[PDB]
Amino acid sequence: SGPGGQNVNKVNSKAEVRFHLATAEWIAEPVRQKIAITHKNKINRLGELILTSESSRYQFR
Amino acid sequence: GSKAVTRHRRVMHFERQKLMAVTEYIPPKPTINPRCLP
Amino acid sequence: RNRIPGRQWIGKHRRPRPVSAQAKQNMIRRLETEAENQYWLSRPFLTAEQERGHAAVRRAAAFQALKAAQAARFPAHRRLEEQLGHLLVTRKWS
RNA sequence: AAAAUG
RNA sequence: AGUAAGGUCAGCUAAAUAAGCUAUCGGGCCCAUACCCCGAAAAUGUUGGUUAUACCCUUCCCGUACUACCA
RNA sequence: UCGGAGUACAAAAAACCCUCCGAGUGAUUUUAAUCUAGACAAACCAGUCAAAAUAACCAUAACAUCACUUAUUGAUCCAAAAUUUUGAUCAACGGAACAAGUUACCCUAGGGAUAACAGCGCAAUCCUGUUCUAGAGUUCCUAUCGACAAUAGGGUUUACGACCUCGAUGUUGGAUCAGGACACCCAAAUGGUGCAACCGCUAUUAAAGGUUCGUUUGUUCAACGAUUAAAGUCCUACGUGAUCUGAGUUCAGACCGGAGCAAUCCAGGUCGGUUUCUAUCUAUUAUAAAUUUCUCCCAGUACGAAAGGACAAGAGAAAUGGGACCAACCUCACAAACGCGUCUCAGAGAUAAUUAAUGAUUUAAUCUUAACCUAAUUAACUCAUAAUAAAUCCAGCCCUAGAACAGGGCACA
RNA sequence: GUUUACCAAAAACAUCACCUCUAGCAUUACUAGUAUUAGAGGCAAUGCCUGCCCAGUGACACCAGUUUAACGGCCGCGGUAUUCUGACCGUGCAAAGGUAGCAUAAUCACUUGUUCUCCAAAUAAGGACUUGUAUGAAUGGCCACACGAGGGUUUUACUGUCUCUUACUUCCAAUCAGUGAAAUUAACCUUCCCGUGAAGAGGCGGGAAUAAAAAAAUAAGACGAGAAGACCCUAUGGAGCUUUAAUU
RNA sequence: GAUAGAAAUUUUUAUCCUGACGCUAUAGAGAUAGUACCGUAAGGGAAAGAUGAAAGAAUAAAAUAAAAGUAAAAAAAAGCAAAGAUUACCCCUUCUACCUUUUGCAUAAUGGUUUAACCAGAAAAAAUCUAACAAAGAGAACUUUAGCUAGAUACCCCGAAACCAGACGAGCUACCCAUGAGCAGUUUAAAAGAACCAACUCAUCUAUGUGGCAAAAUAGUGAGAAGACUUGUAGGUAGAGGUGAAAAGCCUAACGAGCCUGGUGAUAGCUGGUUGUCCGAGAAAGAAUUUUAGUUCAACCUUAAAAAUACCCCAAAAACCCUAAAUUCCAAUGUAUUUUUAAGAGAUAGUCUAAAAAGGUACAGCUUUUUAGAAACGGAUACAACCUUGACUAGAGAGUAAAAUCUUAAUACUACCAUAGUAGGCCUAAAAGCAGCCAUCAAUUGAGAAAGCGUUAAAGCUCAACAAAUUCACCAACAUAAUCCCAAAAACUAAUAACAAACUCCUAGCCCAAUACCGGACUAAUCUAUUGAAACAUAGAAGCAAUAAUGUUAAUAUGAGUAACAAGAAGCCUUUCUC
Numbered sequence A: 001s002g003p004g005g006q007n008v009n010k011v012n013s014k015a016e017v018r019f020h021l022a023t024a025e026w027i028a029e030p031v032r033q034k035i036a037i038t039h040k041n042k043i044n045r046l047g048e049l050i051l052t053s054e055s056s057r058y059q060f061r
Numbered sequence B: 001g002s003k004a005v006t007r008h009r010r011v012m013h014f015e016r017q018k019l020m021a022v023t024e025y026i027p028p029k030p031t032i033n034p035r036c037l038p
Numbered sequence C: 001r002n003r004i005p006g007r008q009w010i011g012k013h014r015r016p017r018p019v020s021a022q023a024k025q026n027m028i029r030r031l032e033t034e035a036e037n038q039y040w041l042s043r044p045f046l047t048a049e050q051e052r053g054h055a056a057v058r059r060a061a062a063f064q065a066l067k068a069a070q071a072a073r074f075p076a077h078r079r080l081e082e083q084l085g086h087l088l089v090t091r092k093w094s
Numbered sequence D: 001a002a003a004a005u006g
Numbered sequence E: 001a002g003u004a005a006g007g008u009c010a011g012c013u014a015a016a017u018a019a020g021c022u023a024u025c026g027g028g029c030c031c032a033u034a035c036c037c038c039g040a041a042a043a044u045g046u047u048g049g050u051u052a053u054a055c056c057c058u059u060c061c062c063g064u065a066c067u068a069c070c071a
Numbered sequence F: 001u002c003g004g005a006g007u008a009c010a011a012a013a014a015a016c017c018c019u020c021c022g023a024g025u026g027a028u029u030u031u032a033a034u035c036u037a038g039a040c041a042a043a044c045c046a047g048u049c050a051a052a053a054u055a056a057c058c059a060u061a062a063c064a065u066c067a068c069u070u071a072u073u074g075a076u077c078c079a080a081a082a083u084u085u086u087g088a089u090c091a092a093c094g095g096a097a098c099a100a101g102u103u104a105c106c107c108u109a110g111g112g113a114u115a116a117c118a119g120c121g122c123a124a125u126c127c128u129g130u131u132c133u134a135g136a137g138u139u140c141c142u143a144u145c146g147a148c149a150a151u152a153g154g155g156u157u158u159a160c161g162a163c164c165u166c167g168a169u170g171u172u173g174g175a176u177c178a179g180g181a182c183a184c185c186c187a188a189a190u191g192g193u194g195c196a197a198c199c200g201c202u203a204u205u206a207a208a209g210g211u212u213c214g215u216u217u218g219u220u221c222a223a224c225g226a227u228u229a230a231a232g233u234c235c236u237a238c239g240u241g242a243u244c245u246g247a248g249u250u251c252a253g254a255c256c257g258g259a260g261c262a263a264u265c266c267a268g269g270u271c272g273g274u275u276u277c278u279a280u281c282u283a284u285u286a287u288a289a290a291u292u293u294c295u296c297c298c299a300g301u302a303c304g305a306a307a308g309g310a311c312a313a314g315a316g317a318a319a320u321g322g323g324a325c326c327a328a329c330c331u332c333a334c335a336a337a338c339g340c341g342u343c344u345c346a347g348a349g350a351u352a353a354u355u356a357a358u359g360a361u362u363u364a365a366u367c368u369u370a371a372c373c374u375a376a377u378u379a380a381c382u383c384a385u386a387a388u389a390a391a392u393c394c395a396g397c398c399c400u401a402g403a404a405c406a407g408g409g410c411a412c413a
Numbered sequence G: 001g002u003u004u005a006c007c008a009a010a011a012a013c014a015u016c017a018c019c020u021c022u023a024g025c026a027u028u029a030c031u032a033g034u035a036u037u038a039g040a041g042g043c044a045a046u047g048c049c050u051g052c053c054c055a056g057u058g059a060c061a062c063c064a065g066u067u068u069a070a071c072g073g074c075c076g077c078g079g080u081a082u083u084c085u086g087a088c089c090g091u092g093c094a095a096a097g098g099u100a101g102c103a104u105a106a107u108c109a110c111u112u113g114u115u116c117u118c119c120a121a122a123u124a125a126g127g128a129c130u131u132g133u134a135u136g137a138a139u140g141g142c143c144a145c146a147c148g149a150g151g152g153u154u155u156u157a158c159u160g161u162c163u164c165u166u167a168c169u170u171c172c173a174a175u176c177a178g179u180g181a182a183a184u185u186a187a188c189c190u191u192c193c194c195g196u197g198a199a200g201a202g203g204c205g206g207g208a209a210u211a212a213a214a215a216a217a218u219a220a221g222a223c224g225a226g227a228a229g230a231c232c233c234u235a236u237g238g239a240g241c242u243u244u245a246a247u248u
Numbered sequence H: 001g002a003u004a005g006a007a008a009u010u011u012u013u014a015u016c017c018u019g020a021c022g023c024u025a026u027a028g029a030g031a032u033a034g035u036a037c038c039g040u041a042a043g044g045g046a047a048a049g050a051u052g053a054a055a056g057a058a059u060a061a062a063a064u065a066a067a068a069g070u071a072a073a074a075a076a077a078a079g080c081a082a083a084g085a086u087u088a089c090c091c092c093u094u095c096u097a098c099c100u101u102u103u104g105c106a107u108a109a110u111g112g113u114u115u116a117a118c119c120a121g122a123a124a125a126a127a128u129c130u131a132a133c134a135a136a137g138a139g140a141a142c143u144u145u146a147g148c149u150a151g152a153u154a155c156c157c158c159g160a161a162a163c164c165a166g167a168c169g170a171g172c173u174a175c176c177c178a179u180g181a182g183c184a185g186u187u188u189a190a191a192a193g194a195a196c197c198a199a200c201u202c203a204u205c206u207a208u209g210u211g212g213c214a215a216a217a218u219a220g221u222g223a224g225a226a227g228a229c230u231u232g233u234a235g236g237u238a239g240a241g242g243u244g245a246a247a248a249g250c251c252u253a254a255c256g257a258g259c260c261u262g263g264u265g266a267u268a269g270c271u272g273g274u275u276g277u278c279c280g281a282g283a284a285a286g287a288a289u290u291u292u293a294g295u296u297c298a299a300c301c302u303u304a305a306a307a308a309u310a311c312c313c314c315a316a317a318a319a320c321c322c323u324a325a326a327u328u329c330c331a332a333u334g335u336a337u338u339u340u341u342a343a344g345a346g347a348u349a350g351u352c353u354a355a356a357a358a359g360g361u362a363c364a365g366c367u368u369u370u371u372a373g374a375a376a377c378g379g380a381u382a383c384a385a386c387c388u389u390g391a392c393u394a395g396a397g398a399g400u401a402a403a404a405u406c407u408u409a410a411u412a413c414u415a416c417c418a419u420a421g422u423a424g425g426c427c428u429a430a431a432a433g434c435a436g437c438c439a440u441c442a443a444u445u446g447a448g449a450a451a452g453c454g455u456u457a458a459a460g461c462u463c464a465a466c467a468a469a470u471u472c473a474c475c476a477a478c479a480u481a482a483u484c485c486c487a488a489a490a491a492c493u494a495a496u497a498a499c500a501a502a503c504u505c506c507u508a509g510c511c512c513a514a515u516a517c518c519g520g521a522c523u524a525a526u527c528u529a530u531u532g533a534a535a536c537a538u539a540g541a542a543g544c545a546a547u548a549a550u551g552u553u554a555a556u557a558u559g560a561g562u563a564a565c566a567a568g569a570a571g572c573c574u575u576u577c578u579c
């Protein structure tokens, strides 16, 4: 979203990273519980945590 | 314009293809099969 | 259905057009001809020391003839006939 | 003039 | 991703005579601490080449700030 | 701007916003002249050497030397010099004597020579399969995964290129209609299971048909509520504005925060903001021969220590879709039209994956890119079957037939 | 109340009120007026108020010095109470280091910040927490009555907006009679699929299709018509605006 | 710098001989006329005529019936509309309309409906040719070490936003100044910048309309409606300005600064166009530059002229740690080309293939350097760059060249049996062939302190050992996209076949392609001087040739007889009925 004209209209530049927390073995268990407690608003009912990025114009950024 | 060394086998120019086909190896074939020749 | 990317005979992926038996036979015939050529080009009649200036007066004469022909370039002669023949355009019957 | 606490 | 300024004693400001106030230690003052009065130690984050000196410029790690716009 | 090295391997030259060193000068005395052959290099301007001959010192050298020695430098004009010189990070360095920003209030000449959208090339990125077994999995690589690695394929995202269009290829989401691919969500047939049964996890084949209704956001996405057999991934100018919508983006107005002294600026947000076309051509303008869920038994039967709990077969109910119709209800002040109302919806062959019979190469076995007939078998797809299917009377008048043209009736009465 | 006549009527402008500055005065404005007056301006009634600064640039003063209801700015680094914090302290620069108030706002991004109410569900709305390191006090900050074709959110009532459209009339529409334009047009005897090609073919290639003409509709295409792209770039091409640009 | 540019001093003899190698109604003045018409005004400003001696010869007579557009006479599969042809219109075969711009255009890049009339190269400094005279030339002023004089050879059209000067505009609109006029009803002690709602004034939202009723409208719906309100007449403020409750608004339908005239044929490195035939040769980029959208040189190339060496080039020769393809210089030889002299313009915005490299991703139809090649009318189905091919004309002759279906789609290994020291020795709860370490002996002809499964440890199931035979037995097989698959087909009659060009022979010749630029020979139509007089010749001149500029004017076509427009009824004829 935002003003970019045809560029924003027809360029996929909004990034979203979604991943399950319970089975994420690359994060320590107490850290996983702490994230599940503090960021419960960003976690849906399937346990998948979602983060999104819209600020930068570039998809890689 | 590709490099001298590539990964896609560098499809060859037609005259070089003809040269390779002409210079393909031809094994010597005897007149009679020696398996159950005497 | 089957597309050739880019142009047909330029890109990294080209047409897989193969070599034919006619092409192979033509190449073999040309190779045999060239082999005969290089066989005939093996033994000269005269050697390099025997051919030293064997034909030089003819080359000098040819160059002199070319020089004379080039130096002869010059405008032609203007005669009285060329000027007086234009008067005939009004030749009438009396 | 100055200068706290136990 | 780029550009600008950088990395100082245990803490901050400096300037190349590496100093000035805090902090530390050892004393004195006091009944005991604190204030105060003395003495000492305390480093340019690192590699290289230099100069009469270094506030010269580069390599390796650190925090940083601003920009990333027209579509 | 100038020089050195590689690119540029061996006469010369040779480029990139190619990879590295530097230079915009210091120190010393031998303070290094005049004139003139002949040559190097070079578009030009410039830069380079230099034999002989002359002036002063040995009566035998003078190229000033060193710091990679190569670069250490600037043209006219004009100013200052006074007889002979100098003066510029003119560094944009072949140099205009001295001139900044912003324009979304903008204008003009052009460019697809040059970007944003689309198309196209490549596949860095992305997505797939297979190859390799160390490891997880109580033993056990492959029930389910599988690090370091290999090969090949697809062109959905972004990036890269700048080839078609800038004397116009109208740009997101939705409304309507959807065409297609299978890398399948369901529906169908199977294999393996760490499959006893139900839920499951993977693997193969199958695209005739479907893939919901709402709150918030312009939203694609996303979060949540209720369901479903399912709320699939894509291509289609990431379909479709000469069919539509204008909420956002994308003009002119105006605020807030920041930058700028200002004009102004914003992939930073808020309100408001003209969406034209009378169809010339291509194209097109109705034959059918169904699908899927839910209830009753099957049966608390098989299967199990019990909790749990089937498949198949058969009866029905519905829903969607195709084709139709007003006896009643409802819309209905025309006799008609219409849904919210009513009726109907199908047999055979055929197969892909996968099971077994018989049997040699390979006298055992083995479903057979060995034959013979085989049998259980998905969806499609064709065919039975169903519809039209009696030519030359057509003035006028009606019609449940119709734009016009056509078509059905005009003897009962 | 006024405004972009012809895409924007507004949250923009103006406005009563409050503040500044500039003027001791006569025959055409101001004004036939005389500081309780008249101009050049800012902000907006009213209520609580308007905190610090002349360091810089302006203006008075022709130098010092005064001015912010002038242009405008109102801080770092580090450790500390018992763990989060830091009442406190050390040190440095300043002209002062952002006071009161309000606060996820019309207020960069993180943002759909966290929480409560409303709904079955809310990136919507309202109330609270709050460094907003880019809020902030006459370029004014906070609340309040009345007000507004301004912008958002609810409660019923209402209904074809919608589930899901249907029926009937008028103008349309089709036929007869009369009159009779327009953009556009290289020529067309103007098909479909795949591939190719200046990288999206009716004209090429390989195949399919193919008596010829009307009339009524739908718009997928003719990269359809309309305007020598308004977006982007170039031009030793313009013009508006502002200055700390250069000559004046 | 671009450029500007004298004077001192010299020459100039009265009058007639004057008309036109200027045009004939898209030309020549704008003119039949500054009139109609467009504009408030300044100002802009046209097109329009054709009989004859007689039309006081209109039952009127004679020459063309030749442009585009129609009718006579609509069309019959298929295709840039044509050609080869053919008994025959089609049917058969073959060619991707034309200019411009580009590396490359059928491109879906630009332009054009058609016809007619107009519309675009202009200069003589230096040079070439010809001629007169010549150490001198020229009809006065100067030039001269073969030069002076004379003549012929030469260099376009259209297009801006803009700047300045002077006029004309406040009858629309912005604001004022005089003079007038309006606001009915209702609630209110009120004429309160109050409230409801009329006339009236604005224009919030939506739907039609979008070449429409309208260059801003209609319908529904809205706000104000005793005031900072509307509105009539007259006047003023005029562009470096006016005015503005700032929208950078309005100032006569386009205002970030009006319109007209003049400068003005403004200027454009930018776009478009540039008009007869044939022939010869014929160019893809090194250096500077407010320069890469262009100019100026060099290297190439064109027309002339002088000469003599020019390409291929054997030895020999060209550096020092290693270094390939190969380069420079020269004999000889096979060819005729090369260098200077004097005129010169174009081009300096480029693609692919093969090779050497770099950047990127050992990615591109990618970008940057060096060598070579190409841009067929044949072949690779279509095609720019790949291959064959020293490009003229006629033939209903022939011989050749490159070239036409490219390869495998493949992995069977079966019987026969297994007893003994012994649980070999160590740690471990256990290690019995098998978590681990060391030895790895020895019985039966025949069997490893055990090469794979399995148990907690065993046990148990397989391998190799004998006895029974003895085909061969090492690796090699791998899914996919979207409108509809893509010539059809074919394993054996003899193949170094055959068919196949712009190649080469044959028969005759007028005897070899081309973009920008350059040179030459002819020539269409006019006027003039001489010929000629059923329309030509030699000379001299130009308003000297149009398939193309969103070209101007006039007439025509397609769209199209389409969109679109109107009059209430009957009647005794203008009398009655419906709104």
Ligand SMILES: Nc1nc2c(ncn2[C@@H]2O[C@H](COP(=O)(O)O)[C@@H](O)[C@H]2O)c(=O)[nH]1
Binding pocket: F078, F087, F088, F097
């Ligand atoms: N210094 C210098 N100035 C020159 C030269 N040539 C021309 N100029 C001009 O002369 C002027 C000198 O003025 P200045 O700068 O000394 O006041 C400048 O405009 C400069 O550009 C030169 O060679 N040297």
Ligand SMILES: Nc1nc2c(ncn2[C@@H]2O[C@H](COP(=O)(O)O)[C@@H](O)[C@H]2O)c(=O)[nH]1
Binding pocket: H283, H284, H347, H515, H516
């Ligand atoms: N610079 C240059 N351009 C050429 C040359 N030949 C042709 N051209 C250019 O190429 C274009 C035409 O292409 P062609 O007709 O030669 O195929 C034109 O732009 C023309 O100027 C040449 O030799 N050199």
Ligand SMILES: [Mg+2]
Binding pocket: A001, A002
């Ligand atoms: Mg938004």
Ligand SMILES: [Mg+2]
Binding pocket: A003
């Ligand atoms: Mg915006």
Ligand SMILES: [Mg+2]
Binding pocket: A003
């Ligand atoms: Mg923007």
Ligand SMILES: [Mg+2]
Binding pocket: A010, A011
């Ligand atoms: Mg994109």
Ligand SMILES: [Mg+2]
Binding pocket: B001, B002
């Ligand atoms: Mg290459």
Ligand SMILES: [Mg+2]
Binding pocket: C004, C005, C006, C007, C008
């Ligand atoms: Mg292609």
Ligand SMILES: [Mg+2]
Binding pocket: C004, C005, C006, C007, C008, C009, C010, C011, C012, C013, C014
């Ligand atoms: Mg290709």
Ligand SMILES: [Mg+2]
Binding pocket: D005
């Ligand atoms: Mg205390």
Ligand SMILES: [Mg+2]
Binding pocket: none
């Ligand atoms: Mg030389």
Ligand SMILES: [Mg+2]
Binding pocket: none
């Ligand atoms: Mg000498």
Ligand SMILES: [Mg+2]
Binding pocket: F092, H290
């Ligand atoms: Mg320059």
Ligand SMILES: [Mg+2]
Binding pocket: none
């Ligand atoms: Mg330069």
Ligand SMILES: [Mg+2]
Binding pocket: none
């Ligand atoms: Mg140079």
Ligand SMILES: [Mg+2]
Binding pocket: none
């Ligand atoms: Mg704006």
